[PDB]
Design a protein around this motif. Structure first.
Motif, PDB file in Angstrom:
ATOM      1  N   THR A 184      -2.525  18.255   4.764  1.00 10.47           N
ATOM      2  CA  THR A 184      -1.884  17.902   6.321  1.00 10.47           C
ATOM      3  C   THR A 184      -0.659  16.572   5.697  1.00 10.47           C
ATOM      4  O   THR A 184      -0.412  16.098   4.461  1.00 10.47           O
ATOM      5  CB  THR A 184      -3.197  16.799   6.637  1.00 10.47           C
ATOM      6  N   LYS A 185       0.807  17.122   6.898  1.00  7.12           N
ATOM      7  CA  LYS A 185       1.610  15.776   5.547  1.00  7.12           C
ATOM      8  C   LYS A 185       1.727  14.567   6.079  1.00  7.12           C
ATOM      9  O   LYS A 185       1.032  14.130   7.517  1.00  7.12           O
ATOM     10  CB  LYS A 185       2.675  16.390   6.988  1.00  7.12           C
ATOM     11  N   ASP A 186       1.906  14.119   5.401  1.00  8.41           N
ATOM     12  CA  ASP A 186       2.006  12.579   5.272  1.00  8.41           C
ATOM     13  C   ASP A 186       2.381  11.743   6.670  1.00  8.41           C
ATOM     14  O   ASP A 186       3.772  12.110   6.786  1.00  8.41           O
ATOM     15  CB  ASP A 186       2.596  11.641   4.071  1.00  8.41           C
ATOM     16  N   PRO A 187       1.565  11.507   7.232  1.00  8.97           N
ATOM     17  CA  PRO A 187       3.116  10.730   8.548  1.00  8.97           C
ATOM     18  C   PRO A 187       3.714   9.514   8.668  1.00  8.97           C
ATOM     19  O   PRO A 187       5.002   8.772   9.212  1.00  8.97           O
ATOM     20  CB  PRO A 187       2.135   9.939   9.477  1.00  8.97           C
ATOM     21  N   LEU A 188       4.138   8.857   7.056  1.00  9.25           N
ATOM     22  CA  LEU A 188       5.212   8.158   6.497  1.00  9.25           C
ATOM     23  C   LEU A 188       6.297   8.496   6.398  1.00  9.25           C
ATOM     24  O   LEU A 188       7.643   7.982   5.950  1.00  9.25           O
ATOM     25  CB  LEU A 188       4.582   6.654   5.525  1.00  9.25           C
ATOM     26  N   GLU A 189       6.341   9.582   6.078  1.00  9.82           N
ATOM     27  CA  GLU A 189       8.087  10.488   5.702  1.00  9.82           C
ATOM     28  C   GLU A 189       7.822  11.034   7.279  1.00  9.82           C
ATOM     29  O   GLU A 189       7.172  12.304   7.085  1.00  9.82           O
ATOM     30  CB  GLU A 189       7.572  10.982   4.839  1.00  9.82           C
ATOM     31  N   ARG A 190       9.259  10.666   7.662  1.00  5.80           N
ATOM     32  CA  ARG A 190       9.510  11.256   8.865  1.00  5.80           C
ATOM     33  C   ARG A 190      10.293  12.058   9.293  1.00  5.80           C
ATOM     34  O   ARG A 190      11.498  12.172   8.432  1.00  5.80           O
ATOM     35  CB  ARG A 190       9.172  10.168  10.096  1.00  5.80           C
ATOM     36  N   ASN A 191      10.921  12.470  10.560  1.00  6.30           N
ATOM     37  CA  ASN A 191      12.312  12.842  10.962  1.00  6.30           C
ATOM     38  C   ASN A 191      12.517  11.953  11.767  1.00  6.30           C
ATOM     39  O   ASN A 191      12.179  11.381  12.904  1.00  6.30           O
ATOM     40  CB  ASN A 191      12.252  14.734  11.706  1.00  6.30           C
TER      41      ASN A 191
ATOM     42  N   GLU B 129       0.760  -1.063   0.120  1.00  8.35           N
ATOM     43  CA  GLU B 129       0.363   0.284  -0.289  1.00  8.35           C
ATOM     44  C   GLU B 129       0.652   1.112  -0.266  1.00  8.35           C
ATOM     45  O   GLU B 129       1.881   1.474   0.176  1.00  8.35           O
ATOM     46  CB  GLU B 129      -1.157   0.203   1.382  1.00  8.35           C
ATOM     47  N   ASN B 130       0.304   2.197  -0.538  1.00  9.49           N
ATOM     48  CA  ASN B 130       1.148   3.632  -0.673  1.00  9.49           C
ATOM     49  C   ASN B 130       0.038   4.965  -1.022  1.00  9.49           C
ATOM     50  O   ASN B 130      -0.377   5.015  -1.364  1.00  9.49           O
ATOM     51  CB  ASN B 130       1.894   3.499  -2.427  1.00  9.49           C
ATOM     52  N   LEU B 131       0.219   4.945   0.700  1.00  9.72           N
ATOM     53  CA  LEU B 131      -0.682   6.481   0.824  1.00  9.72           C
ATOM     54  C   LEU B 131      -0.499   7.127   0.454  1.00  9.72           C
ATOM     55  O   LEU B 131      -0.999   9.027   0.359  1.00  9.72           O
ATOM     56  CB  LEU B 131      -1.712   6.764   2.225  1.00  9.72           C
ATOM     57  N   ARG B 132       0.101   7.452  -1.157  1.00 12.86           N
ATOM     58  CA  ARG B 132      -0.126   9.025  -1.720  1.00 12.86           C
ATOM     59  C   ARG B 132      -1.255   9.549  -2.323  1.00 12.86           C
ATOM     60  O   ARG B 132      -1.133  10.789  -1.794  1.00 12.86           O
ATOM     61  CB  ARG B 132       1.505   8.664  -2.738  1.00 12.86           C
ATOM     62  N   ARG B 133      -2.052   8.650  -2.349  1.00 16.07           N
ATOM     63  CA  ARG B 133      -3.226   9.834  -3.189  1.00 16.07           C
ATOM     64  C   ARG B 133      -3.562   9.992  -1.749  1.00 16.07           C
ATOM     65  O   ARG B 133      -4.948  11.471  -2.578  1.00 16.07           O
ATOM     66  CB  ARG B 133      -3.954   8.283  -4.026  1.00 16.07           C
ATOM     67  N   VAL B 134      -4.041   9.696  -0.430  1.00 20.46           N
ATOM     68  CA  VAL B 134      -4.866  10.392   0.554  1.00 20.46           C
ATOM     69  C   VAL B 134      -4.095  11.821   1.110  1.00 20.46           C
ATOM     70  O   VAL B 134      -5.293  12.880   0.801  1.00 20.46           O
ATOM     71  CB  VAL B 134      -4.610   9.481   1.692  1.00 20.46           C
ATOM     72  N   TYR B 135      -3.202  12.195   1.110  1.00 18.07           N
ATOM     73  CA  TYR B 135      -2.655  13.723   1.350  1.00 18.07           C
ATOM     74  C   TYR B 135      -1.362  14.029   0.258  1.00 18.07           C
ATOM     75  O   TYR B 135      -1.332  15.446   0.138  1.00 18.07           O
ATOM     76  CB  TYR B 135      -1.420  13.114   1.702  1.00 18.07           C
ATOM     77  N   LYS B 136      -1.962  13.863  -1.114  1.00 18.90           N
ATOM     78  CA  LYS B 136      -1.688  14.595  -2.757  1.00 18.90           C
ATOM     79  C   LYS B 136      -2.613  16.286  -2.207  1.00 18.90           C
ATOM     80  O   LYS B 136      -4.119  16.020  -2.453  1.00 18.90           O
ATOM     81  CB  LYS B 136      -2.170  14.584  -3.572  1.00 18.90           C
ATOM     82  N   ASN B 137      -1.805  17.523  -2.510  1.00 19.44           N
ATOM     83  CA  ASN B 137      -2.565  18.718  -2.316  1.00 19.44           C
ATOM     84  C   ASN B 137      -3.483  18.886  -1.027  1.00 19.44           C
ATOM     85  O   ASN B 137      -4.375  19.662  -0.919  1.00 19.44           O
ATOM     86  CB  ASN B 137      -3.949  19.240  -3.720  1.00 19.44           C
ATOM     87  N   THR B 138      -3.037  18.491  -0.356  1.00 20.88           N
ATOM     88  CA  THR B 138      -4.054  18.674   1.175  1.00 20.88           C
ATOM     89  C   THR B 138      -2.844  19.342   1.829  1.00 20.88           C
ATOM     90  O   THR B 138      -1.413  19.805   1.601  1.00 20.88           O
ATOM     91  CB  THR B 138      -4.523  17.977   2.469  1.00 20.88           C
TER      92      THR B 138
ATOM     93  N   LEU C  55      -9.189  29.825 -18.253  1.00 20.52           N
ATOM     94  CA  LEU C  55      -9.411  29.818 -16.787  1.00 20.52           C
ATOM     95  C   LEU C  55      -9.555  28.159 -16.166  1.00 20.52           C
ATOM     96  O   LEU C  55     -10.353  27.861 -16.338  1.00 20.52           O
ATOM     97  CB  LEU C  55     -10.816  30.490 -16.736  1.00 20.52           C
ATOM     98  N   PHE C  56      -8.806  28.386 -14.989  1.00 20.34           N
ATOM     99  CA  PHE C  56      -9.083  27.814 -14.335  1.00 20.34           C
ATOM    100  C   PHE C  56      -9.132  27.985 -12.166  1.00 20.34           C
ATOM    101  O   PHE C  56      -9.418  28.748 -12.081  1.00 20.34           O
ATOM    102  CB  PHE C  56      -7.562  26.691 -14.422  1.00 20.34           C
ATOM    103  N   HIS C  57     -10.163  26.275 -11.988  1.00 21.96           N
ATOM    104  CA  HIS C  57     -10.845  26.140 -10.524  1.00 21.96           C
ATOM    105  C   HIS C  57     -10.564  24.952  -9.958  1.00 21.96           C
ATOM    106  O   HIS C  57     -10.844  24.131 -11.011  1.00 21.96           O
ATOM    107  CB  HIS C  57     -12.369  26.539 -11.186  1.00 21.96           C
ATOM    108  N   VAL C  58     -10.303  25.173  -9.358  1.00 16.45           N
ATOM    109  CA  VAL C  58      -9.542  24.492  -8.730  1.00 16.45           C
ATOM    110  C   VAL C  58      -9.817  24.311  -6.754  1.00 16.45           C
ATOM    111  O   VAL C  58      -8.917  24.843  -6.655  1.00 16.45           O
ATOM    112  CB  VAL C  58      -8.536  23.450  -9.125  1.00 16.45           C
ATOM    113  N   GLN C  59     -10.583  22.936  -6.324  1.00 21.54           N
ATOM    114  CA  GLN C  59     -10.578  23.530  -4.766  1.00 21.54           C
ATOM    115  C   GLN C  59     -10.005  22.395  -4.392  1.00 21.54           C
ATOM    116  O   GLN C  59     -10.758  21.384  -4.643  1.00 21.54           O
ATOM    117  CB  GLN C  59     -12.314  23.605  -4.235  1.00 21.54           C
ATOM    118  N   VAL C  60      -9.451  22.096  -3.367  1.00 19.44           N
ATOM    119  CA  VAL C  60      -8.528  21.649  -2.573  1.00 19.44           C
ATOM    120  C   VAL C  60      -8.720  19.899  -2.432  1.00 19.44           C
ATOM    121  O   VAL C  60      -9.888  20.577  -1.147  1.00 19.44           O
ATOM    122  CB  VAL C  60      -6.715  21.992  -1.984  1.00 19.44           C
ATOM    123  N   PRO C  61      -8.178  19.215  -1.668  1.00 23.80           N
ATOM    124  CA  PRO C  61      -9.025  18.078  -0.922  1.00 23.80           C
ATOM    125  C   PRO C  61      -7.999  18.774  -0.038  1.00 23.80           C
ATOM    126  O   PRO C  61      -7.595  19.877   0.785  1.00 23.80           O
ATOM    127  CB  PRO C  61      -7.926  17.274  -1.276  1.00 23.80           C
TER     128      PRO C  61
END
Lengths: 43, 49
Positions: A32-39, A21-30, B43-49
């Motif tokens: 909130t930081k992905d918790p599987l990449e850490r310090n 599993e690869n949770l990239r799609r959940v955190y993309k453009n959100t 023109l582009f319209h984008v609302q983030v998740p």
């Protein structure tokens, strides 16, 4: 109670089959930081 | 005497933009009123998740 077929990648290792599993799609453009990449610290 | 054997000319091979492989990168469109327009915007319209 019922089941739904869905497709995912599986690794076979030591008589255990494990879901990969690869949770990239959940955190993309959100925001909130992905918790599987850490310090990790070392002194 | 001096002999003139064949006289030859440049039988040039032509190139066409849409035959090029580079044309894949383009979506080519012909517009006859292009001399009249000066602005093209999309023109582009984008609302983030």
């Amino acid at each position: 109670h019922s089941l739904t077929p869905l497709s995912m990648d599986v690794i076979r290792l030591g008589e255990k089959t494990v879901i990969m599993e690869n949770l990239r799609r959940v955190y993309k453009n959100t925001d909130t930081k992905d918790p599987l990449e850490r310090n990790v610290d070392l002194t | 005497f001096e002999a003139i054997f064949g006289t030859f000319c440049n039988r040039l091979e032509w190139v066409y933009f849409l035959t090029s492989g580079l044309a894949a990168a383009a979506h080519a469109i012909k517009f006859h009123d292009l001399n009249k327009l000066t602005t093209g915007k999309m023109l582009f319209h984008v609302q983030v998740p």
